[PDB]
Design a protein around this ligand. Structure first.
Ligand SMILES: CC(C)=CCC/C(C)=C\CC/C(C)=C/CC/C(C)=C/COP(=O)(O)OP(=O)(O)O
Ligand SMILES: CC(C)=CCC/C(C)=C\CC/C(C)=C/CC/C(C)=C/COP(=O)(O)OP(=O)(O)O
Ligand SMILES: C=C(C)CCSP(=O)(O)OP(=O)(O)O
Ligand SMILES: C=C(C)CCSP(=O)(O)OP(=O)(O)O
Ligand SMILES: [Mg+2]
Ligand SMILES: [Mg+2]
Lengths: 320, 182, 320, 182
């Protein structure tokens, strides 16, 4: 699994620069590959899985300890039942060998998360995923996120439903809805946003993958077919990320400064409105506006922390 | 005049974007992008959104319209900002959660379809094709909800963009195969 | 006029610390001194004037290049006509020897300002003061401010009248009235606020002197009778100022930070009010509140600079 | 009880302040100044203003009143801030300049007397005597308009002020000769 002479060498050279902490993959091209190698479609998806395993060894060797992969889209439920069942049994086959290979998970501290609208999967596939996810919680050496029956819109809209659920239960006031609150309700709320997003084959589209989370991720479209993915593709991807890093860091940084600035700007407006309605003057040495602003944010942080605490509790799917 | 020329150009491509987005990552030159937008109208693209992460075009909006009408002498345009993306998604959230608070809508009643009906783009199609100009390999916050299937074609600069350069990009999009998950 | 061995020495020691740029004197005790030395009241005021001349030589030697002195209060117009005429002829006598000693003024760059409600003085005394003040403008080696027919309340209320005059003429909107605008309309608007205020004899009151300007000046009450003022009194006064300086600097500094902070706090409230009335939302990426704040202050600075430019023009009393 | 004792104390001085100010320059100890104020009432001072440059007493106002009523078991109080000084003078300016703008008052109509009628202290006499506690030799912004004739007596700290200490200060003010310019 360890890298060769050249791979070890180039790794050492880029590791001297900014490395990505989190890489996201759209493993695309499995069927086209199968047509080139004249193997059935299922063998292309099997070979596609082998590559997902190898490239994780590459990231683990490069220090990239968080990886998100697009494994099955809700849109893919429109394929042939032959193809789809073929995919479903492949997921059954691999999620089963994961428990046969337990303890090795405990040895390497590999945490497995499966994100998406998993209620659409076969009940047995759900039970397998659940056992795998639960058995691997409290592991922190490295993290794999597997997006199964996922689209970003379904994740984003679910993230707003959980916040409306909080509104509905008294946990949350609609003025509390914020960008970061939505961030903490996505399936990926445990991970940081990907530094890089990688889509294989010639496609220059995102196909409903982490649209929210990759708004400032560095986008890499490589023409290679996913079953053909080599270390140097992954390398070139990182190479592109380092070249964009300065630009993306400040763009990312100044997006956050502007939103915080606007947050305050929008916040102090209402505190002005409340004082104007109360008639209590805008600014004063008693620093009422100053003190009433610390009250607004503190009472908001309290409600949000209380909202999140319950969500993660409800997110406990011991049965699942 | 030369309008029929550009009509037959756009009409000749296997596919033409219904909604096109222009992402400028690079000060931006109003004369240049004001002529990218009139090209889209001439070839037959219905909607053009222009975007930038620093919000330069949204501030200097009217100044961009003046350059657009000026170059229309050589012859449905939104100027977006990061506000148009995540901020608008978080706006629709607050609009829906208060319907849930009014006991009018249920939290379970929001789906992918209804949330789309709730965004500011409720009066436009999603962008079919995005032209990204500049060195940045990121969307930089362009309409994250809406770019789920958009084709993203990059060009190194809008610095002195030629018609051939712009039209070479439309040829790439015309040749793109959208499988839509099937 | 130059300092003695010990005076030179102690001067050098304090000059190693923070020195005051501006000292203000309430020359009090002239009559009590005259009763002790059994000389007529006029001789006490004459001897009182001699001391004002000597102590200025001390400040000029100590580098203190700005001095304000309380020479005649509006309240003193209630004394006997004998006393008051005695004072008035003393001022005539000295303001006349100032022009006899012109050119020496031009040599030492001494600028003389006479502050107060000078219309109450005898017409001839007014003409003398005016000639002296005009002849000494454009001098900048050192500055003496002589408060003749002055009370702080009469100066403060006059300072508000000039601002109402500006309101009355379209130069100024009543929202433009500010602490610093009032600062630029006082008689002393050419000088900085005194670092030290010195009142002699045993009195622990300010008797309507620079109340506005000395709100953070270091207050020194010395029991010496003003005609008896020695270098070491002035020294001890400075000594007290250095000991207070750290405390007074930060108190002075944090007063200015709080007022600026409240200024913004009070300013952005109205910009919120205007946007709320216009309905244009509080904060936005178009940064309207940000841009409309730069418009409010800039259009205020313009009106105020235009108000001040006319005031200093009207303040031209070539005839006087 | 001991109330007649303090009545005869204040009654025995040649002069007693009608309005007394307490300037704290030094965290300040509420228990201590809350007992300075009740001393003034017991001896017969009508108005007591307490002041501090950091505005501590104006913020923790109610907490100071609680300490005052508590020590009244051992038996007309304003808590001021820098706002009370220059800021209020600049408030009255804006009030008058708009009367001038309404063509109701003339700019020449404001004098020393009318400006005094316009300040927040229009319902109180000027402070006859100010007790300054602490190391600072400045008024630090205490009512600049109002202290034109006030006697300013300093004490090194309110840290553990005794009745004898406080009453020694009233004896100094009783002996002060206000000549009022004559
Ligand atoms: C190891 C863990 C935790 C889970 C296993 C994850 C699984 C079951 C599979 C991952 C590998 C795999 C089967 C990827 C295929 C997913 C997919 C639909 C890829 C899209 O490629 P295609 O669209 O089929 O090929 P074309 O683009 O040529 O049509
Ligand atoms: C040199 C220049 C530019 C001007 C001359 C300034 C003049 C005319 C005189 C300054 C010296 C002087 C006469 C000071 C006396 C002012 C005054 C009324 C002092 C108060 O002391 P008193 O109140 O009279 O003494 P008591 O306190 O004992 O009653
Ligand atoms: C499972 C994944 C890798 C996500 C779906 S990638 P997909 O082949 O569907 O890409 P499309 O051309 O949009 O269909
Ligand atoms: C001319 C001056 C030094 C200002 C007047 S000092 P004055 O003697 O009037 O002090 P008061 O005891 O208040 O009368
Ligand atoms: Mg595919
Ligand atoms: Mg006197």
């Amino acid at each position: 699994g360890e890298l060769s002479l050249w791979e070890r060498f180039c790794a050492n050279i880029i590791k001297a620069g900014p490395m990505p902490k989190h890489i996201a993959f759209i493993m695309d091209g499995n069927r086209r590959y199968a047509k080139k190698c004249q193997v059935e479609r299922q063998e292309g998806h099997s070979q596609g899985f082998n590559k997902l395993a190898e490239t994780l060894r590459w990231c683990l060797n490069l220090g990239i300890l968080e990886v998100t992969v697009y494994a099955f889209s809700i849109e893919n439920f429109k394929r042939s039942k032959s193809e789809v069942d073929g995919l479903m049994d492949l997921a059954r086959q691999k999620f089963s060998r994961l428990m046969e290979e337990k303890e090795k998970l405990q040895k390497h501290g590999v945490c497995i998360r499966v994100l998406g609208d998993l209620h659409l999967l076969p009940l047995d596939l759900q039970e397998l995923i659940a056992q795998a996810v639960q058995a691997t919680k409290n592991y922190n050496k490295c993290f794999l996120n597997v997006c199964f029956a996922y689209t970003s819109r379904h994740e984003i809209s679910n993230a707003v439903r959980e916040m409306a659920w909080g509104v509905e239960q008294g946990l949350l006031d609609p003025s509390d809805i914020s960008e970061s609150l939505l961030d903490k309700c996505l399936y990926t709320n445990r991970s940081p946003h990907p530094d890089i997003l990688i889509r294989t084959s010639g496609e220059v589209r995102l196909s409903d993958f982490l649209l929210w989370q990759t708004s400032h991720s560095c986008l890499v479209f490589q023409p290679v077919l996913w079953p053909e993915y080599t270390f140097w593709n992954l390398f070139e991807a990182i190479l592109q990320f380092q070249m964009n890093h300065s630009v993306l860091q400040k763009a990312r940084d100044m997006y956050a400064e502007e939103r915080k600035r606007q947050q305050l700007e929008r916040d102090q407006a209402t505190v002005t409105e409340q004082l104007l309605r109360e008639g209590l003057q805008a600014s004063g040495d008693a620093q009422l506006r100053r003190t009433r602003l610390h009250k607004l944010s503190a009472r908001r942080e309290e409600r949000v922390q209380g909202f999140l605490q319950a969500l993660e509790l409800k997110r406990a799917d011991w049965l699942a | 005049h030369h309008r029929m020329r550009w009509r037959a150009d756009g009409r000749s491509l296997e596919k033409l974007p219904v909604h096109m987005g222009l992402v400028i990552t690079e000060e931006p030159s109003f004369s240049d992008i004001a002529s990218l937008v009139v090209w889209c109208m001439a070839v037959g693209i219905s909607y053009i959104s222009v975007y930038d992460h620093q919000g330069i075009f949204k501030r200097n909006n009217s100044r961009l319209m003046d350059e657009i009408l000026k170059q229309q002498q050589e012859l449905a345009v939104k100027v977006l900002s990061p506000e148009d993306g995540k901020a608008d998604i978080v706006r629709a959230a607050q609009d829906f959660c208060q319907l849930v608070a009014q006991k009018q809508k249920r939290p379970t009643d929001l789906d992918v379809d209804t949330l789309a009906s709730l965004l500011s783009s409720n009066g436009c199609p999603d962008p079919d094709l995005v032209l990204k100009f500049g060195p940045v390999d990121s969307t930089l916050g362009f309409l994250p909800w809406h770019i789920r299937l958009t084709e993203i074609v990059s060009l190194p600069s809008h610095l002195n963009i030629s018609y051939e350069d712009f039209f070479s990009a439309l040829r790439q999009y015309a040749a793109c195969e959208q499988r839509l998950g099937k």
